[PDB]
Design an enzyme around this catalytic site. Structure first.
Site, PDB file in Angstrom:
ATOM      1  N   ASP A 178       0.765  -1.230   0.000  1.00 37.27           N
ATOM      2  CA  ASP A 178       0.000   0.000   0.000  1.00 37.27           C
ATOM      3  C   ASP A 178       0.809   1.303   0.000  1.00 37.27           C
ATOM      4  O   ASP A 178       1.217   1.804   1.049  1.00 37.27           O
ATOM      5  CB  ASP A 178      -0.940  -0.063   1.212  1.00 37.27           C
ATOM      6  CG  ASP A 178      -1.998   1.012   1.204  1.00 37.27           C
ATOM      7  OD1 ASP A 178      -1.966   1.895   0.326  1.00 37.27           O
ATOM      8  OD2 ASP A 178      -2.856   0.973   2.100  1.00 37.27           O
ATOM      9  N   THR A 179       0.977   1.874  -1.189  1.00 40.86           N
ATOM     10  CA  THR A 179       1.715   3.125  -1.364  1.00 40.86           C
ATOM     11  C   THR A 179       0.984   4.318  -0.729  1.00 40.86           C
ATOM     12  O   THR A 179       1.582   5.374  -0.512  1.00 40.86           O
ATOM     13  CB  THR A 179       1.948   3.414  -2.859  1.00 40.86           C
ATOM     14  OG1 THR A 179       0.681   3.569  -3.516  1.00 40.86           O
ATOM     15  CG2 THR A 179       2.710   2.263  -3.509  1.00 40.86           C
ATOM     16  N   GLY A 180      -0.312   4.148  -0.469  1.00 43.69           N
ATOM     17  CA  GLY A 180      -1.111   5.193   0.153  1.00 43.69           C
ATOM     18  C   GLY A 180      -1.120   5.123   1.674  1.00 43.69           C
ATOM     19  O   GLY A 180      -1.867   5.848   2.332  1.00 43.69           O
TER      20      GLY A 180
HETATM   21  C1  LIG Z   1      -7.531  -0.408   5.039  1.00 46.87           C
HETATM   22  C2  LIG Z   1      -8.106  -0.430   3.622  1.00 46.87           C
HETATM   23  C3  LIG Z   1      -7.062  -0.803   2.557  1.00 46.87           C
HETATM   24  C4  LIG Z   1      -6.014   0.280   2.362  1.00 46.87           C
HETATM   25  C5  LIG Z   1      -6.641   1.669   2.291  1.00 46.87           C
HETATM   26  C6  LIG Z   1      -5.619   2.766   2.510  1.00 46.87           C
HETATM   27  N1  LIG Z   1      -6.001   3.990   2.175  1.00 46.87           N
HETATM   28  C7  LIG Z   1      -5.149   5.141   2.415  1.00 46.87           C
HETATM   29  C8  LIG Z   1      -5.856   6.381   1.871  1.00 46.87           C
HETATM   30  C9  LIG Z   1      -5.879   7.562   2.787  1.00 46.87           C
HETATM   31  C10 LIG Z   1      -4.502   8.117   3.005  1.00 46.87           C
HETATM   32  C11 LIG Z   1      -4.575   9.115   4.125  1.00 46.87           C
HETATM   33  C12 LIG Z   1      -5.000   5.188   3.950  1.00 46.87           C
HETATM   34  O1  LIG Z   1      -5.986   5.027   4.670  1.00 46.87           O
HETATM   35  N2  LIG Z   1      -3.768   5.343   4.440  1.00 46.87           N
HETATM   36  C13 LIG Z   1      -3.511   5.378   5.885  1.00 46.87           C
HETATM   37  C14 LIG Z   1      -3.064   3.986   6.376  1.00 46.87           C
HETATM   38  C15 LIG Z   1      -2.711   3.872   7.872  1.00 46.87           C
HETATM   39  C16 LIG Z   1      -1.294   4.321   8.212  1.00 46.87           C
HETATM   40  N3  LIG Z   1      -1.068   4.664   9.476  1.00 46.87           N
HETATM   41  O2  LIG Z   1      -0.416   4.354   7.351  1.00 46.87           O
HETATM   42  C17 LIG Z   1      -2.468   6.433   6.238  1.00 46.87           C
HETATM   43  O3  LIG Z   1      -1.478   6.596   5.519  1.00 46.87           O
HETATM   44  N4  LIG Z   1      -2.707   7.154   7.336  1.00 46.87           N
HETATM   45  C18 LIG Z   1      -1.786   8.188   7.818  1.00 46.87           C
HETATM   46  C19 LIG Z   1      -2.416   9.576   7.728  1.00 46.87           C
HETATM   47  C20 LIG Z   1      -2.548  10.161   6.344  1.00 46.87           C
HETATM   48  C21 LIG Z   1      -2.192  11.678   6.409  1.00 46.87           C
HETATM   49  N5  LIG Z   1      -2.892  12.484   5.391  1.00 46.87           N
HETATM   50  C22 LIG Z   1      -3.930  13.267   5.651  1.00 46.87           C
HETATM   51  N6  LIG Z   1      -4.431  13.380   6.885  1.00 46.87           N
HETATM   52  N7  LIG Z   1      -4.550  13.870   4.653  1.00 46.87           N
HETATM   53  C23 LIG Z   1      -1.347   7.964   9.264  1.00 46.87           C
HETATM   54  N8  LIG Z   1      -2.211   7.643  10.105  1.00 46.87           N
HETATM   55  O4  LIG Z   1      -0.158   8.196   9.569  1.00 46.87           O
HETATM   56  N9  LIG Z   1      -7.618   1.723   1.220  1.00 46.87           N
HETATM   57  C24 LIG Z   1      -8.717   2.451   1.354  1.00 46.87           C
HETATM   58  O5  LIG Z   1      -8.903   3.207   2.314  1.00 46.87           O
HETATM   59  C25 LIG Z   1      -9.729   2.363   0.206  1.00 46.87           C
HETATM   60  N10 LIG Z   1     -10.564   1.185   0.447  1.00 46.87           N
HETATM   61  C26 LIG Z   1     -10.457   0.079  -0.287  1.00 46.87           C
HETATM   62  O6  LIG Z   1      -9.673  -0.015  -1.236  1.00 46.87           O
HETATM   63  C27 LIG Z   1     -11.402  -1.084   0.074  1.00 46.87           C
HETATM   64  N11 LIG Z   1     -12.122  -0.890   1.340  1.00 46.87           N
HETATM   65  C28 LIG Z   1     -11.946  -1.678   2.400  1.00 46.87           C
HETATM   66  C29 LIG Z   1     -12.808  -1.279   3.594  1.00 46.87           C
HETATM   67  O7  LIG Z   1     -11.165  -2.633   2.417  1.00 46.87           O
HETATM   68  C30 LIG Z   1     -12.389  -1.279  -1.105  1.00 46.87           C
HETATM   69  C31 LIG Z   1     -13.238  -2.544  -0.914  1.00 46.87           C
HETATM   70  O8  LIG Z   1     -13.247  -0.137  -1.202  1.00 46.87           O
HETATM   71  C32 LIG Z   1     -10.591   3.647   0.182  1.00 46.87           C
HETATM   72  C33 LIG Z   1      -9.731   4.841  -0.247  1.00 46.87           C
HETATM   73  C34 LIG Z   1     -11.829   3.457  -0.708  1.00 46.87           C
HETATM   74  C35 LIG Z   1     -11.542   3.084  -2.157  1.00 46.87           C
END
Ligand SMILES: CCCC[C@@H](CN[C@@H](CCCC)C(=O)N[C@@H](CCC(N)=O)C(=O)N[C@@H](CCCNC(N)=[NH2+])C(N)=O)NC(=O)[C@@H](NC(=O)[C@@H](NC(C)=O)[C@@H](C)O)[C@@H](C)CC
EC number: 3.4.23.16
Lengths: 99, 99
Positions: free
Chosen positions: A25-27
């Site tokens: 997950d690059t995101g």
């Molecule tokens: C858990 C679900 C699989 C991975 C996830 C990661 N998405 C990124 C997108 C948002 C980026 C902010 C994410 O949540 N990243 C988090 C992951 C947790 C982590 N700690 O790394 C992140 O980087 N969070 C940062 C904060 C981001 C800062 N940016 C900001 N606030 N704008 C953190 N907590 O440090 N994918 C999703 O959220 C996508 N969901 C999905 O692909 C699937 N849904 C499910 C529920 O599985 C599909 C069936 O819809 C969303 C976008 C809908 C299409």
């Protein structure tokens, strides 16, 4: 390897000696794994996603194998919808996006 | 081009005649863009991840440019904290993960 995105970029990982499946997950800034028993000391942490925040256990310097590649870093263990390997570990295995 | 993962893989996109910054997210099945008044028919939809689900408007056949690469597909518009380019569009610009 080179991984296309027509299907979810799922890979097998080895953590705590146990084989699991995780999404490259690059995101994701960090690596979040479903609740499990993991050898190590941890501290409460809160992370964010598309619909809000969740509480996780932050384990530092965890040894983990991702698709045959070794990484040693922070692993968060909590109620994540899916096991995800974040940038913190993908950088360790030299993963890059290309198009 | 090649995009490393030391920091968030952010790219410039063009949608609805507007330029925005979006995150290339290999962990996202679909593309979620911040609230914008896109013209045309749409379908109610709910998408989720960490934190839960959010309500969005599903727009089909949306022409979007990602990092200078044309693409056309489904775009979900709603209260997302970050503009997210998912696999549905990343596949169209021929993006792959490599390590
Ligand atoms: C858990 C679900 C699989 C991975 C996830 C990661 N998405 C990124 C997108 C948002 C980026 C902010 C994410 O949540 N990243 C988090 C992951 C947790 C982590 N700690 O790394 C992140 O980087 N969070 C940062 C904060 C981001 C800062 N940016 C900001 N606030 N704008 C953190 N907590 O440090 N994918 C999703 O959220 C996508 N969901 C999905 O692909 C699937 N849904 C499910 C529920 O599985 C599909 C069936 O819809 C969303 C976008 C809908 C299409």
């Amino acid at each position: 390897p080179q991984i296309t995105l027509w299907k979810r970029p799922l890979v097998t990982i080895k953590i705590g000696g146990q084989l699991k499946e995780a999404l490259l997950d690059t995101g994701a800034d960090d690596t979040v794994i479903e609740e499990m028993s993991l050898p190590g000391r941890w501290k409460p942490k809160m992370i964010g996603g598309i619909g809000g925040f969740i509480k996780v256990r932050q384990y530092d310097q965890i040894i983990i194998e991702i698709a045959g590649h070794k990484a040693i870093g922070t692993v968060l263990v909590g109620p994540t919808p899916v096991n995800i390997i974040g940038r913190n570990l993908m950088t360790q295995i030299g993963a890059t996006l290309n198009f």
